[PDB]
Write a protein that binds this ligand. Structure first.
Ligand code: HEM
Ligand code: DSO
Ligand code: K
Length: 404
């Protein structure tokens, strides 16, 4: 527990540990939702992980994400040392500079690119599911979720299929740290892969995402090799753990809820609505910002350089945003959330992510409608900047399935 800074009043101290919340065993969203109990202020200070603020309610989370002038993305991660080393584009950049980098990234992941990839995502989902179907079991996280978004990225980026295991190794090294290397070290190992490919595609560009990014124009001039590297790093990583972990939460819920499965089986037109409601209930990201100056925010004195965690996960779980927030209802009229963030850095991959989710659910429920958690398995969650599922053993009777 880091020493309490003099400017932080005692009554605001709640020692929440974002990497190991108490009662994690009861579900990660539930563990974070303790920050929304009635005796907890809207803005608290935890002495864990170096000490930082946490905004606990959707209203403050949204407001801080809007106010980039006070709440900077220069140091967006807890602990401070990771936030400082992090230089991905556009996620470590503030407006106004961020705007045009964001525009360039949008060219390679935006809605028209997604409408085009639709059928290719479907063919990949089908091949994975058909490979598992007659086995009557899988670890969903390992056997479907982990192979799926990396394969979509390779297609986007014109990278060879044979590079997948190495690239998976490099990205896992960075986002699932075991303590053997600093974030900085992992980032450099990732950059070492990207550097030659960027060099090759600035000399001989194709029409893949890396070529488009590495030869783009930003803020008047050509993008540097350095900036292209920093953007490619994000385009690769941004869609991996988020999608893997989110698909896992969703499938865990569906395995545990026969009635919700049956709803989507009987009413497949509800899957897009179901996707949105699961994005709210099983929201999973929590990054934040650093104070650019002393600032009073909702009656609380914040100090220049303080970090503030602004958990995207919490907005939609807030009972002030959605009534009975832990209840899943696919017919919810106004599904409010900030699962993809808010403000100037709102997820550029959100359209791609939704197709990945919807295609997965549609294809899985068509082929393997009836499945359960393996009996005696207790699903373990993990908490951090991207919270997730450690493993997801599923079982089914292959006689209830259909090759489609
Ligand atoms: C369920 C899946 C996903 C979730 C929950 C998610 C969540 C988020 C969040 C919360 C942010 C904002 C972070 C901040 O403000 O600091 C973000 C930004 C971003 N995401 Fe996603 N994301 C997902 C999938 C993807 C995918 C598939 C891609 C494709 C590569 C992607 C690419 C990006 C990029 C490029 C940004 C930066 C936008 C900017 O800085 O202007 N995301 N995402
Ligand atoms: C004791 N001290 C001080 C410590 C020292 C060292 C490590 C510590 C750890 S730690 O070992 O768990 N390290 C935490 C750092 C992990 C960050 C990696 C994510 C980057 C990739 N993702 C994105 O860019 C994105 C950016 C954006 C938001 C989000 C989703 C998408 C989009 C991708 C993330 C925990 C606790 C304490 C530690
Ligand atoms: K930084």
């Amino acid at each position: 527990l880091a020493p309490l800074p003099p400017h932080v009043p005692e009554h605001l101290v709640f020692d929440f540990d974002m990497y190991n919340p108490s009662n994690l065993s009861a579900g990660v969203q539930e563990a974070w939702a303790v920050l929304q109990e009635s005796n907890v202020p809207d803005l608290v200070w935890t002495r864990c992980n170096g000490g930082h603020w946490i905004a606990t309610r959707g209203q403050l989370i949204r407001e801080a994400y809007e106010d980039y002038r006070h709440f900077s993305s220069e140091c967006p991660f807890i602990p401070r040392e990771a936030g400082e080393a992090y230089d991905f584009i556009p996620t470590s950049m503030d407006p106004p500079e961020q705007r045009q980098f964001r525009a360039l990234a949008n060219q390679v992941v935006g809605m028209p690119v997604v409408d085009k990839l639709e059928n290719r995502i479907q063919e990949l989902a089908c091949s994975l599911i058909e490979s598992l179907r007659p086995q009557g079991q899988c670890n969903f996280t390992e056997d479907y979720a982990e192979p799926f978004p990396i394969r979509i990225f390779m297609l986007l980026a014109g990278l060879p299929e044979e590079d997948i295991p190495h690239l998976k190794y490099l990205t896992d090294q960075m986002t699932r740290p075991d303590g053997s290397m600093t974030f900085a070290e992992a980032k450099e190992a990732l950059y070492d892969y990207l550097i030659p490919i960027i060099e090759q595609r600035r000399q001989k560009p194709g029409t893949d995402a890396i070529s488009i990014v590495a030869n783009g124009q930003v803020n008047g001039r050509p993008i540097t090799s350095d900036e292209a590297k920093r953007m490619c790093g994000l385009l690769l990583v941004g869609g991996l753990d988020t999608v893997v972990n989110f698909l896992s939460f969703s499938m865990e819920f569906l395995a545990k809820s026969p009635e919700h499965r049956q709803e989507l089986i009987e009413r497949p037109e509800r899957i897009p609505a179901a996707c949105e409601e699961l994005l709210r209930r099983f929201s999973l990201v929590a990054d934040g910002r650093i104070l650019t100056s002393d600032y009073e925010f909702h009656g609380v004195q914040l100090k220049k350089g303080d970090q503030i965690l602004l958990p995207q996960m919490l907005s939609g779980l807030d009972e002030r945003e959605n009534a009975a927030p832990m209840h899943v209802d696919f017919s919810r009229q106004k599904v409010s959330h900030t699962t993809f963030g808010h403000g100037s850095h709102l997820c550029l991959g959100q359209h791609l992510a939704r197709r990945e989710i919807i295609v997965t659910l549609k294809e899985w429920l068509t082929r393997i409608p009836d499945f359960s958690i393996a009996p005696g398995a207790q699903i373990q969650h993990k908490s951090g900047i991207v919270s997730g599922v450690q493993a997801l053993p599923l079982v089914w009777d292959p006689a209830t399935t259909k090759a489609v």
